[PDB]
Each structure stands twice: as C-alpha cells, then as structure tokens.
Amino acid sequence: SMVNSFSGYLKLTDNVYIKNADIVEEAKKVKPTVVVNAANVYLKHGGGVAGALNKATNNAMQVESDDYIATNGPLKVGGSCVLSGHNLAKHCLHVVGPNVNKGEDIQLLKSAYENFNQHEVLLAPLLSAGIFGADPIHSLRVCVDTVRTNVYLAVFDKNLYDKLVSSFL
C-alpha cells in the first residue's frame, strides 16, 4: 500500500490500525480524504463523536446536514451519506450504527461497517461505541471482519484503547 501520514498507530491486521486519539485533533492534523462520523438517522450532531466533529466545524456540519435531511429525508440504520469534511477532511462519511439505547439490532453493525469499503482509506471511530451503547470490543471485531479497505481507528478513552489492544485476537 502507499505511504500515508497517519502516525503512531498500532497495526492490528493487514488493513486495520488503531490509536488512542481524539478524532477531532487527528483529523485536523492529517486532513484525511475521509473522516467517518458516528451519525444518527437525522444527522443531529448533538453529542459523542458527532457533537465533537460538528463543534470543530463551528456548526457548519450541522447546517449542511439539515439541508441534506430536508432534501433527502433520514438515513437508514446501517446506512450512510457522504458530505463535506469542512475543516477536518476532504469528505465526511456519516455512518449510522445501531444505537442499543434505542433497541436497534446489533447485526446492523456489520451493514454499517460495509459502508467503509466504498473508500480506500478512512479515519474512523468505532461504530456504535460510546453513547450508542454497544460493546467496543465487539465493534472492533466486526470492523476487522468486515472492512477490507484501510481504516485508522481513533479511540477516545485511553483505558478502553488499552483493553481493545490487550483483548484483540
């Protein structure tokens, strides 16, 4: 594969890399072609990764997203759309993982990760982790077993990062 500027990642597999990092700061530094947002179907970027990415864009992500929804309607759980990356990336891939706090079926997590295969290289969070309520160890497993393109995972919490690495098979 071609050399790229992602730095300090642990290599998990042929195509999956992981780092304890703030995805906002990572994106600002690297300016990747694609940053993944942990979106919901309404593209309401209130909290978690989405709230942080949107805040870093000075709410431009939300303004763009509101126009997207007005034109196209909600996304599907497991679905995605490509919008601007604003000051963070060329593009933002908004991906909707299932929210366990909404009762959504965890099997949709695989469908959510399949969206990553449409992009050769991505900076991403673990889908359905954090406030979406899924087990991040499971999310990492689904990622490795689903994504075939090159994915650089940013894990917000240091303790969780260490547990993901130390439990990885």
GROMACS .gro file of N, CA and C in nm:
model
  507
    1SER      N    1   0.085  -0.123   0.000
    1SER     CA    2   0.000   0.000   0.000
    1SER      C    3   0.087   0.125   0.000
    2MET      N    4   0.028   0.237  -0.041
    2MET     CA    5   0.102   0.362  -0.047
    2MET      C    6   0.125   0.418   0.093
    3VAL      N    7   0.239   0.484   0.110
    3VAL     CA    8   0.270   0.551   0.236
    3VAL      C    9   0.168   0.661   0.262
    4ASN      N   10   0.134   0.680   0.389
    4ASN     CA   11   0.044   0.787   0.429
    4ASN      C   12   0.094   0.847   0.559
    5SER      N   13   0.029   0.956   0.600
    5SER     CA   14   0.078   1.038   0.710
    5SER      C   15   0.022   0.998   0.846
    6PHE      N   16  -0.061   0.895   0.854
    6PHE     CA   17  -0.109   0.852   0.985
    6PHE      C   18   0.011   0.804   1.067
    7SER      N   19   0.021   0.852   1.191
    7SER     CA   20   0.139   0.831   1.273
    7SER      C   21   0.101   0.773   1.409
    8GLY      N   22   0.185   0.683   1.460
    8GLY     CA   23   0.165   0.631   1.593
    8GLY      C   24   0.057   0.528   1.609
    9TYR      N   25   0.009   0.469   1.499
    9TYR     CA   26  -0.094   0.366   1.509
    9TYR      C   27  -0.032   0.229   1.534
   10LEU      N   28  -0.102   0.148   1.614
   10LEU     CA   29  -0.073   0.006   1.627
   10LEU      C   30  -0.141  -0.068   1.512
   11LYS      N   31  -0.069  -0.159   1.448
   11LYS     CA   32  -0.123  -0.236   1.337
   11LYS      C   33  -0.193  -0.359   1.393
   12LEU      N   34  -0.323  -0.372   1.372
   12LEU     CA   35  -0.395  -0.490   1.419
   12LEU      C   36  -0.397  -0.601   1.316
   13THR      N   37  -0.420  -0.565   1.189
   13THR     CA   38  -0.428  -0.661   1.081
   13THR      C   39  -0.364  -0.600   0.956
   14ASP      N   40  -0.377  -0.670   0.844
   14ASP     CA   41  -0.326  -0.617   0.719
   14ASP      C   42  -0.380  -0.478   0.688
   15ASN      N   43  -0.505  -0.448   0.727
   15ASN     CA   44  -0.571  -0.324   0.685
   15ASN      C   45  -0.627  -0.238   0.798
   16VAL      N   46  -0.623  -0.283   0.923
   16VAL     CA   47  -0.682  -0.211   1.035
   16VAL      C   48  -0.573  -0.169   1.133
   17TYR      N   49  -0.576  -0.040   1.167
   17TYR     CA   50  -0.481   0.027   1.256
   17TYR      C   51  -0.560   0.097   1.365
   18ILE      N   52  -0.498   0.117   1.482
   18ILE     CA   53  -0.568   0.176   1.597
   18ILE      C   54  -0.475   0.264   1.678
   19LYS      N   55  -0.532   0.371   1.736
   19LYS     CA   56  -0.456   0.467   1.814
   19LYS      C   57  -0.545   0.528   1.920
   20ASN      N   58  -0.488   0.556   2.038
   20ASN     CA   59  -0.556   0.636   2.139
   20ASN      C   60  -0.544   0.781   2.095
   21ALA      N   61  -0.654   0.838   2.049
   21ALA     CA   62  -0.651   0.973   1.995
   21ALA      C   63  -0.790   1.033   1.995
   22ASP      N   64  -0.791   1.166   2.002
   22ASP     CA   65  -0.907   1.250   1.979
   22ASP      C   66  -0.927   1.263   1.829
   23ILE      N   67  -1.037   1.208   1.776
   23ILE     CA   68  -1.057   1.205   1.632
   23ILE      C   69  -1.060   1.346   1.573
   24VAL      N   70  -1.107   1.445   1.649
   24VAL     CA   71  -1.105   1.583   1.601
   24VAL      C   72  -0.962   1.630   1.578
   25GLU      N   73  -0.875   1.607   1.676
   25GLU     CA   74  -0.737   1.653   1.663
   25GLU      C   75  -0.664   1.573   1.556
   26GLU      N   76  -0.691   1.442   1.549
   26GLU     CA   77  -0.634   1.359   1.443
   26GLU      C   78  -0.672   1.415   1.306
   27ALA      N   79  -0.801   1.443   1.286
   27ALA     CA   80  -0.847   1.492   1.157
   27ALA      C   81  -0.783   1.626   1.123
   28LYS      N   82  -0.778   1.718   1.219
   28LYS     CA   83  -0.717   1.848   1.193
   28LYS      C   84  -0.572   1.832   1.150
   29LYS      N   85  -0.501   1.736   1.210
   29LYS     CA   86  -0.359   1.716   1.181
   29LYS      C   87  -0.338   1.654   1.044
   30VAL      N   88  -0.409   1.546   1.016
   30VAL     CA   89  -0.386   1.465   0.897
   30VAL      C   90  -0.461   1.519   0.775
   31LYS      N   91  -0.578   1.579   0.795
   31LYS     CA   92  -0.664   1.622   0.686
   31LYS      C   93  -0.690   1.504   0.592
   32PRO      N   94  -0.742   1.393   0.645
   32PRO     CA   95  -0.761   1.274   0.562
   32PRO      C   96  -0.862   1.300   0.451
   33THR      N   97  -0.856   1.216   0.349
   33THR     CA   98  -0.957   1.220   0.245
   33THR      C   99  -1.096   1.197   0.303
   34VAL      N  100  -1.108   1.103   0.398
   34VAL     CA  101  -1.237   1.069   0.458
   34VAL      C  102  -1.223   1.058   0.609
   35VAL      N  103  -1.305   1.134   0.682
   35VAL     CA  104  -1.329   1.111   0.824
   35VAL      C  105  -1.470   1.056   0.839
   36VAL      N  106  -1.486   0.954   0.922
   36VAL     CA  107  -1.616   0.895   0.950
   36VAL      C  108  -1.677   0.961   1.073
   37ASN      N  109  -1.804   0.999   1.061
   37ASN     CA  110  -1.885   1.044   1.173
   37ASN      C  111  -1.975   0.932   1.223
   38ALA      N  112  -1.987   0.924   1.355
   38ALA     CA  113  -2.082   0.837   1.424
   38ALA      C  114  -2.218   0.907   1.425
   39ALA      N  115  -2.287   0.899   1.312
   39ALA     CA  116  -2.410   0.973   1.288
   39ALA      C  117  -2.534   0.898   1.338
   40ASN      N  118  -2.643   0.974   1.350
   40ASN     CA  119  -2.777   0.918   1.364
   40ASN      C  120  -2.858   0.947   1.237
   41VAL      N  121  -2.976   0.885   1.228
   41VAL     CA  122  -3.052   0.892   1.103
   41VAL      C  123  -3.095   1.033   1.067
   42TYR      N  124  -3.107   1.121   1.166
   42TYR     CA  125  -3.149   1.259   1.144
   42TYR      C  126  -3.032   1.354   1.123
   43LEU      N  127  -2.909   1.302   1.128
   43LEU     CA  128  -2.789   1.385   1.123
   43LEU      C  129  -2.796   1.500   1.223
   44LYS      N  130  -2.844   1.470   1.344
   44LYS     CA  131  -2.848   1.567   1.454
   44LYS      C  132  -2.723   1.541   1.538
   45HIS      N  133  -2.622   1.626   1.521
   45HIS     CA  134  -2.488   1.601   1.574
   45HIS      C  135  -2.475   1.661   1.714
   46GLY      N  136  -2.544   1.600   1.810
   46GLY     CA  137  -2.559   1.663   1.940
   46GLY      C  138  -2.450   1.633   2.041
   47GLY      N  139  -2.395   1.512   2.035
   47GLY     CA  140  -2.302   1.465   2.136
   47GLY      C  141  -2.218   1.351   2.083
   48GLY      N  142  -2.135   1.296   2.171
   48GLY     CA  143  -2.042   1.194   2.129
   48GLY      C  144  -1.948   1.244   2.021
   49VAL      N  145  -1.906   1.152   1.935
   49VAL     CA  146  -1.818   1.188   1.823
   49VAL      C  147  -1.884   1.294   1.736
   50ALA      N  148  -2.013   1.277   1.706
   50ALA     CA  149  -2.079   1.370   1.613
   50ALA      C  150  -2.081   1.511   1.670
   51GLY      N  151  -2.116   1.525   1.797
   51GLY     CA  152  -2.117   1.657   1.857
   51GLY      C  153  -1.980   1.721   1.856
   52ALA      N  154  -1.875   1.641   1.878
   52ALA     CA  155  -1.739   1.693   1.877
   52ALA      C  156  -1.696   1.734   1.737
   53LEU      N  157  -1.719   1.648   1.637
   53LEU     CA  158  -1.684   1.686   1.500
   53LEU      C  159  -1.758   1.812   1.459
   54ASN      N  160  -1.888   1.817   1.486
   54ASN     CA  161  -1.965   1.933   1.444
   54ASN      C  162  -1.916   2.061   1.512
   55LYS      N  163  -1.888   2.054   1.642
   55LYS     CA  164  -1.837   2.170   1.714
   55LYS      C  165  -1.708   2.219   1.650
   56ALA      N  166  -1.621   2.126   1.609
   56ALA     CA  167  -1.495   2.165   1.546
   56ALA      C  168  -1.515   2.237   1.413
   57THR      N  169  -1.627   2.212   1.345
   57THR     CA  170  -1.662   2.282   1.222
   57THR      C  171  -1.737   2.412   1.246
   58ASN      N  172  -1.751   2.455   1.372
   58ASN     CA  173  -1.824   2.578   1.401
   58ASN      C  174  -1.970   2.567   1.356
   59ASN      N  175  -2.027   2.447   1.364
   59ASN     CA  176  -2.166   2.416   1.329
   59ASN      C  177  -2.190   2.410   1.178
   60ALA      N  178  -2.088   2.425   1.095
   60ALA     CA  179  -2.110   2.414   0.951
   60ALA      C  180  -2.157   2.273   0.912
   61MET      N  181  -2.109   2.170   0.982
   61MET     CA  182  -2.154   2.035   0.955
   61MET      C  183  -2.304   2.023   0.977
   62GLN      N  184  -2.353   2.081   1.086
   62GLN     CA  185  -2.496   2.074   1.115
   62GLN      C  186  -2.578   2.148   1.011
   63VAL      N  187  -2.534   2.267   0.970
   63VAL     CA  188  -2.607   2.343   0.869
   63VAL      C  189  -2.619   2.263   0.740
   64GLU      N  190  -2.508   2.206   0.695
   64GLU     CA  191  -2.508   2.124   0.574
   64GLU      C  192  -2.599   2.004   0.591
   65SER      N  193  -2.593   1.941   0.708
   65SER     CA  194  -2.671   1.822   0.734
   65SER      C  195  -2.820   1.852   0.734
   66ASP      N  196  -2.860   1.967   0.787
   66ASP     CA  197  -3.002   2.000   0.793
   66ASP      C  198  -3.058   2.015   0.651
   67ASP      N  199  -2.979   2.075   0.561
   67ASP     CA  200  -3.020   2.083   0.421
   67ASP      C  201  -3.027   1.944   0.358
   68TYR      N  202  -2.929   1.858   0.388
   68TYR     CA  203  -2.932   1.720   0.337
   68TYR      C  204  -3.064   1.652   0.375
   69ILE      N  205  -3.100   1.659   0.503
   69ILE     CA  206  -3.221   1.591   0.551
   69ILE      C  207  -3.346   1.653   0.489
   70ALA      N  208  -3.350   1.785   0.480
   70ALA     CA  209  -3.468   1.848   0.421
   70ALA      C  210  -3.489   1.798   0.278
   71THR      N  211  -3.381   1.775   0.204
   71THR     CA  212  -3.394   1.729   0.066
   71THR      C  213  -3.422   1.579   0.057
   72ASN      N  214  -3.352   1.498   0.137
   72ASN     CA  215  -3.346   1.354   0.116
   72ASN      C  216  -3.417   1.271   0.221
   73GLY      N  217  -3.451   1.329   0.336
   73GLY     CA  218  -3.507   1.254   0.446
   73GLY      C  219  -3.401   1.178   0.524
   74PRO      N  220  -3.444   1.114   0.633
   74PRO     CA  221  -3.350   1.042   0.719
   74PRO      C  222  -3.272   0.933   0.647
   75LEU      N  223  -3.156   0.903   0.704
   75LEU     CA  224  -3.080   0.786   0.666
   75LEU      C  225  -3.142   0.661   0.728
   76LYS      N  226  -3.098   0.545   0.679
   76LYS     CA  227  -3.133   0.417   0.739
   76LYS      C  228  -3.031   0.383   0.848
   77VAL      N  229  -3.076   0.311   0.952
   77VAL     CA  230  -2.979   0.249   1.042
   77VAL      C  231  -2.899   0.147   0.961
   78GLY      N  232  -2.766   0.155   0.970
   78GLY     CA  233  -2.676   0.079   0.886
   78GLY      C  234  -2.633   0.151   0.760
   79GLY      N  235  -2.694   0.266   0.731
   79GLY     CA  236  -2.667   0.342   0.611
   79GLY      C  237  -2.569   0.455   0.633
   80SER      N  238  -2.550   0.533   0.527
   80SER     CA  239  -2.451   0.640   0.527
   80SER      C  240  -2.481   0.742   0.420
   81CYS      N  241  -2.415   0.857   0.431
   81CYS     CA  242  -2.406   0.952   0.321
   81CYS      C  243  -2.271   1.020   0.327
   82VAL      N  244  -2.225   1.069   0.212
   82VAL     CA  245  -2.101   1.144   0.201
   82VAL      C  246  -2.134   1.293   0.192
   83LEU      N  247  -2.078   1.371   0.283
   83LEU     CA  248  -2.093   1.516   0.285
   83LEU      C  249  -1.954   1.579   0.295
   84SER      N  250  -1.948   1.711   0.305
   84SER     CA  251  -1.820   1.778   0.315
   84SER      C  252  -1.748   1.740   0.445
   85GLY      N  253  -1.615   1.738   0.438
   85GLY     CA  254  -1.535   1.728   0.558
   85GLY      C  255  -1.501   1.860   0.621
   86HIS      N  256  -1.544   1.971   0.563
   86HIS     CA  257  -1.524   2.104   0.621
   86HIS      C  258  -1.375   2.124   0.648
   87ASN      N  259  -1.338   2.172   0.766
   87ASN     CA  260  -1.201   2.196   0.806
   87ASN      C  261  -1.131   2.073   0.861
   88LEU      N  262  -1.193   1.956   0.853
   88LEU     CA  263  -1.141   1.834   0.914
   88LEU      C  264  -1.086   1.733   0.814
   89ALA      N  265  -1.136   1.734   0.691
   89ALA     CA  266  -1.111   1.628   0.595
   89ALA      C  267  -1.167   1.675   0.461
   90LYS      N  268  -1.132   1.605   0.353
   90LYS     CA  269  -1.199   1.638   0.227
   90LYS      C  270  -1.347   1.606   0.236
   91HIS      N  271  -1.378   1.485   0.284
   91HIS     CA  272  -1.513   1.434   0.295
   91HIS      C  273  -1.540   1.382   0.434
   92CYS      N  274  -1.666   1.389   0.475
   92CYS     CA  275  -1.714   1.319   0.594
   92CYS      C  276  -1.813   1.212   0.551
   93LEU      N  277  -1.783   1.087   0.584
   93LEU     CA  278  -1.875   0.976   0.567
   93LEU      C  279  -1.955   0.962   0.695
   94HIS      N  280  -2.082   1.004   0.691
   94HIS     CA  281  -2.173   0.992   0.804
   94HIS      C  282  -2.230   0.852   0.803
   95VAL      N  283  -2.198   0.770   0.903
   95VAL     CA  284  -2.241   0.631   0.909
   95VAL      C  285  -2.326   0.611   1.033
   96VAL      N  286  -2.442   0.548   1.016
   96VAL     CA  287  -2.534   0.522   1.126
   96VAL      C  288  -2.518   0.378   1.174
   97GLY      N  289  -2.449   0.360   1.286
   97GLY     CA  290  -2.452   0.232   1.354
   97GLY      C  291  -2.578   0.220   1.437
   98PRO      N  292  -2.618   0.098   1.471
   98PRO     CA  293  -2.733   0.081   1.561
   98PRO      C  294  -2.704   0.140   1.699
   99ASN      N  295  -2.805   0.203   1.756
   99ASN     CA  296  -2.800   0.259   1.891
   99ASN      C  297  -2.872   0.160   1.983
  100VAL      N  298  -2.795   0.092   2.066
  100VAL     CA  299  -2.852  -0.004   2.159
  100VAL      C  300  -2.946   0.066   2.258
  101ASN      N  301  -2.923   0.192   2.288
  101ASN     CA  302  -3.015   0.263   2.377
  101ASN      C  303  -3.147   0.298   2.308
  102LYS      N  304  -3.160   0.264   2.179
  102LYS     CA  305  -3.285   0.271   2.105
  102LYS      C  306  -3.340   0.132   2.074
  103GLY      N  307  -3.273   0.025   2.118
  103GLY     CA  308  -3.317  -0.110   2.090
  103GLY      C  309  -3.286  -0.162   1.952
  104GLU      N  310  -3.193  -0.099   1.881
  104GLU     CA  311  -3.168  -0.133   1.741
  104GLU      C  312  -3.079  -0.256   1.730
  105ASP      N  313  -3.102  -0.336   1.627
  105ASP     CA  314  -3.040  -0.468   1.619
  105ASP      C  315  -2.891  -0.457   1.588
  106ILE      N  316  -2.811  -0.520   1.674
  106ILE     CA  317  -2.666  -0.511   1.664
  106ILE      C  318  -2.614  -0.571   1.535
  107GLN      N  319  -2.691  -0.660   1.472
  107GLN     CA  320  -2.647  -0.716   1.344
  107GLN      C  321  -2.629  -0.607   1.239
  108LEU      N  322  -2.707  -0.498   1.250
  108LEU     CA  323  -2.691  -0.385   1.161
  108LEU      C  324  -2.552  -0.325   1.172
  109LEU      N  325  -2.476  -0.360   1.277
  109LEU     CA  326  -2.341  -0.304   1.284
  109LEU      C  327  -2.256  -0.349   1.166
  110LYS      N  328  -2.273  -0.474   1.120
  110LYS     CA  329  -2.196  -0.518   1.004
  110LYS      C  330  -2.233  -0.437   0.881
  111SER      N  331  -2.363  -0.416   0.858
  111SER     CA  332  -2.407  -0.334   0.745
  111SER      C  333  -2.347  -0.194   0.753
  112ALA      N  334  -2.342  -0.137   0.874
  112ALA     CA  335  -2.283  -0.005   0.892
  112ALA      C  336  -2.137  -0.003   0.849
  113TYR      N  337  -2.059  -0.102   0.894
  113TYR     CA  338  -1.917  -0.105   0.857
  113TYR      C  339  -1.896  -0.131   0.708
  114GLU      N  340  -1.990  -0.198   0.640
  114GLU     CA  341  -1.973  -0.222   0.497
  114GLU      C  342  -1.960  -0.091   0.420
  115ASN      N  343  -2.017   0.019   0.471
  115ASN     CA  344  -2.002   0.147   0.403
  115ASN      C  345  -1.855   0.187   0.390
  116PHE      N  346  -1.770   0.144   0.484
  116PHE     CA  347  -1.630   0.183   0.478
  116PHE      C  348  -1.562   0.127   0.354
  117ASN      N  349  -1.611   0.014   0.300
  117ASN     CA  350  -1.546  -0.049   0.186
  117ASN      C  351  -1.557   0.032   0.058
  118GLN      N  352  -1.640   0.136   0.057
  118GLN     CA  353  -1.651   0.226  -0.058
  118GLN      C  354  -1.543   0.333  -0.060
  119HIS      N  355  -1.448   0.329   0.034
  119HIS     CA  356  -1.343   0.430   0.048
  119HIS      C  357  -1.211   0.361   0.076
  120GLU      N  358  -1.107   0.398   0.002
  120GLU     CA  359  -0.982   0.322   0.010
  120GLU      C  360  -0.910   0.341   0.143
  121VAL      N  361  -0.925   0.458   0.206
  121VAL     CA  362  -0.857   0.492   0.331
  121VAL      C  363  -0.949   0.583   0.412
  122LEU      N  364  -0.967   0.552   0.540
  122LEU     CA  365  -1.056   0.628   0.628
  122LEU      C  366  -0.995   0.645   0.766
  123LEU      N  367  -1.023   0.760   0.828
  123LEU     CA  368  -1.007   0.782   0.972
  123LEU      C  369  -1.145   0.767   1.035
  124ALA      N  370  -1.157   0.684   1.139
  124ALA     CA  371  -1.290   0.650   1.189
  124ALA      C  372  -1.290   0.622   1.338
  125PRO      N  373  -1.406   0.641   1.403
  125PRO     CA  374  -1.429   0.589   1.537
  125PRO      C  375  -1.486   0.447   1.526
  126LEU      N  376  -1.490   0.378   1.640
  126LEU     CA  377  -1.560   0.251   1.648
  126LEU      C  378  -1.711   0.275   1.644
  127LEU      N  379  -1.776   0.219   1.543
  127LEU     CA  380  -1.919   0.240   1.526
  127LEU      C  381  -1.997   0.175   1.641
  128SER      N  382  -2.103   0.243   1.682
  128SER     CA  383  -2.195   0.202   1.786
  128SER      C  384  -2.133   0.202   1.925
  129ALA      N  385  -2.008   0.246   1.940
  129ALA     CA  386  -1.946   0.258   2.071
  129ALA      C  387  -1.991   0.388   2.139
  130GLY      N  388  -1.934   0.414   2.257
  130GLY     CA  389  -1.969   0.535   2.329
  130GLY      C  390  -2.116   0.541   2.360
  131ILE      N  391  -2.177   0.658   2.336
  131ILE     CA  392  -2.317   0.680   2.369
  131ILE      C  393  -2.414   0.598   2.286
  132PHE      N  394  -2.368   0.527   2.182
  132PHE     CA  395  -2.455   0.437   2.109
  132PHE      C  396  -2.472   0.302   2.180
  133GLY      N  397  -2.395   0.275   2.285
  133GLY     CA  398  -2.429   0.169   2.378
  133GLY      C  399  -2.380   0.029   2.347
  134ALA      N  400  -2.311   0.006   2.236
  134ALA     CA  401  -2.260  -0.126   2.205
  134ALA      C  402  -2.127  -0.149   2.275
  135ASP      N  403  -2.088  -0.276   2.282
  135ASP     CA  404  -1.958  -0.313   2.338
  135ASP      C  405  -1.848  -0.278   2.239
  136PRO      N  406  -1.755  -0.189   2.273
  136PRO     CA  407  -1.649  -0.153   2.177
  136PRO      C  408  -1.562  -0.270   2.134
  137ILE      N  409  -1.543  -0.371   2.220
  137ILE     CA  410  -1.467  -0.489   2.179
  137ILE      C  411  -1.537  -0.560   2.064
  138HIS      N  412  -1.670  -0.573   2.073
  138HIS     CA  413  -1.748  -0.630   1.964
  138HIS      C  414  -1.740  -0.544   1.839
  139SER      N  415  -1.750  -0.412   1.855
  139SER     CA  416  -1.741  -0.325   1.738
  139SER      C  417  -1.608  -0.342   1.666
  140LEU      N  418  -1.498  -0.353   1.740
  140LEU     CA  419  -1.368  -0.372   1.677
  140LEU      C  420  -1.363  -0.504   1.601
  141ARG      N  421  -1.420  -0.610   1.659
  141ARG     CA  422  -1.424  -0.739   1.593
  141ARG      C  423  -1.500  -0.731   1.462
  142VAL      N  424  -1.619  -0.669   1.464
  142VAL     CA  425  -1.696  -0.654   1.341
  142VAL      C  426  -1.619  -0.571   1.239
  143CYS      N  427  -1.554  -0.464   1.285
  143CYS     CA  428  -1.473  -0.383   1.194
  143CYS      C  429  -1.369  -0.468   1.122
  144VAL      N  430  -1.288  -0.541   1.199
  144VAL     CA  431  -1.181  -0.620   1.139
  144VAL      C  432  -1.236  -0.723   1.043
  145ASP      N  433  -1.350  -0.782   1.076
  145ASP     CA  434  -1.408  -0.889   0.996
  145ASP      C  435  -1.495  -0.840   0.881
  146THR      N  436  -1.513  -0.709   0.866
  146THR     CA  437  -1.600  -0.653   0.763
  146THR      C  438  -1.528  -0.557   0.670
  147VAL      N  439  -1.447  -0.468   0.726
  147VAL     CA  440  -1.378  -0.367   0.648
  147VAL      C  441  -1.255  -0.429   0.583
  148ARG      N  442  -1.243  -0.410   0.452
  148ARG     CA  443  -1.130  -0.457   0.373
  148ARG      C  444  -1.039  -0.345   0.326
  149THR      N  445  -1.088  -0.221   0.327
  149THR     CA  446  -1.008  -0.104   0.294
  149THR      C  447  -0.928  -0.063   0.418
  150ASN      N  448  -0.844   0.037   0.403
  150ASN     CA  449  -0.751   0.073   0.509
  150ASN      C  450  -0.818   0.169   0.604
  151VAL      N  451  -0.832   0.126   0.729
  151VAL     CA  452  -0.902   0.202   0.830
  151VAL      C  453  -0.811   0.229   0.949
  152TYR      N  454  -0.808   0.357   0.988
  152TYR     CA  455  -0.732   0.410   1.100
  152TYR      C  456  -0.834   0.449   1.207
  153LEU      N  457  -0.838   0.371   1.314
  153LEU     CA  458  -0.936   0.388   1.421
  153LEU      C  459  -0.878   0.474   1.532
  154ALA      N  460  -0.954   0.576   1.570
  154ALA     CA  461  -0.921   0.665   1.681
  154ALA      C  462  -1.012   0.632   1.798
  155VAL      N  463  -0.952   0.593   1.911
  155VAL     CA  464  -1.026   0.554   2.031
  155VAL      C  465  -1.008   0.664   2.135
  156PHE      N  466  -1.120   0.724   2.178
  156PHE     CA  467  -1.114   0.841   2.266
  156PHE      C  468  -1.054   0.808   2.402
  157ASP      N  469  -1.097   0.698   2.463
  157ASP     CA  470  -1.061   0.668   2.601
  157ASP      C  471  -0.936   0.580   2.608
  158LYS      N  472  -0.836   0.626   2.685
  158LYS     CA  473  -0.710   0.552   2.695
  158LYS      C  474  -0.730   0.414   2.758
  159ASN      N  475  -0.807   0.406   2.867
  159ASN     CA  476  -0.834   0.277   2.928
  159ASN      C  477  -0.898   0.181   2.829
  160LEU      N  478  -0.997   0.230   2.753
  160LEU     CA  479  -1.062   0.145   2.654
  160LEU      C  480  -0.964   0.105   2.544
  161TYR      N  481  -0.883   0.199   2.497
  161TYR     CA  482  -0.783   0.166   2.396
  161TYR      C  483  -0.695   0.050   2.444
  162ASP      N  484  -0.648   0.057   2.568
  162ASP     CA  485  -0.559  -0.047   2.618
  162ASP      C  486  -0.631  -0.181   2.626
  163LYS      N  487  -0.760  -0.179   2.663
  163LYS     CA  488  -0.838  -0.303   2.671
  163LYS      C  489  -0.865  -0.361   2.533
  164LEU      N  490  -0.891  -0.275   2.434
  164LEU     CA  491  -0.913  -0.322   2.298
  164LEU      C  492  -0.788  -0.391   2.243
  165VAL      N  493  -0.672  -0.331   2.267
  165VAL     CA  494  -0.547  -0.392   2.222
  165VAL      C  495  -0.522  -0.523   2.295
  166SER      N  496  -0.532  -0.520   2.428
  166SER     CA  497  -0.491  -0.635   2.508
  166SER      C  498  -0.585  -0.754   2.494
  167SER      N  499  -0.706  -0.734   2.443
  167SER     CA  500  -0.802  -0.842   2.422
  167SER      C  501  -0.816  -0.882   2.276
  168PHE      N  502  -0.736  -0.824   2.186
  168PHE     CA  503  -0.755  -0.847   2.044
  168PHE      C  504  -0.697  -0.980   1.998
  169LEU      N  505  -0.773  -1.051   1.914
  169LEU     CA  506  -0.728  -1.180   1.863
  169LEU      C  507  -0.741  -1.161   1.711
   0.00000   0.00000   0.00000
